[PDB]
């Protein structure tokens, strides 16, 4: 059971991070565009 | 030990974002403070 909870929260957090990281990829390239 | 290193994952993980979006939030704040 314990392993189950650890596992599930792992998958959720990688979901979260991937979305957040794509978003700021977009934001940083936007910052660079307004730089140029 | 199956716990010990599986559990050893999250703390670096939760440390990753916490450092990560900091500048990413700081920069987009610094996007907002001086652009719009």
């Amino acid at each position, epitope marked *: 059971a314990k392993i189950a*909870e*650890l596992q*599930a*929260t792992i998958e*959720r*957090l990688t979901s979260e991070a991937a979305l957040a990281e794509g978003a700021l990829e977009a934001a940083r390239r936007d910052r660079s565009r307004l730089q140029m | 030990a199956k716990i010990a290193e599986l*559990q050893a994952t*999250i*703390e670096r993980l*939760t*440390s990753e*974002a*916490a*450092l990560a*979006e*900091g*500048a990413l*939030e*700081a920069a987009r704040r610094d996007r907002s403070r001086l652009q719009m």
Partner: nanobody
Amino acid sequence: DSLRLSCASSRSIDGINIMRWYRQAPGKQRGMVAVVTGWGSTNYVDSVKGRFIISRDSAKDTVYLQMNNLKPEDTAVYSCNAIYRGSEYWGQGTQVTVS
């Protein structure tokens, strides 16, 4: 400031998954502030080192977080926000002046 924060769950007490704090300057996108997990790991969002700190008991899952002699610009809605039992969950969020 000179105030206390008290963040609990009505259930799922202390099954301490990853669980987080949030804030948002209005008209914008809400985000990360502070997070504690199965270990109460000592990390938050960079803008904290020395200003926002965790402190927990499972009393009613009423985890706390330390918000003293503040920094103003945070003036916005704050919200602890926890993710439990394979699913995320969201609190109310309260308008808050800090300055």
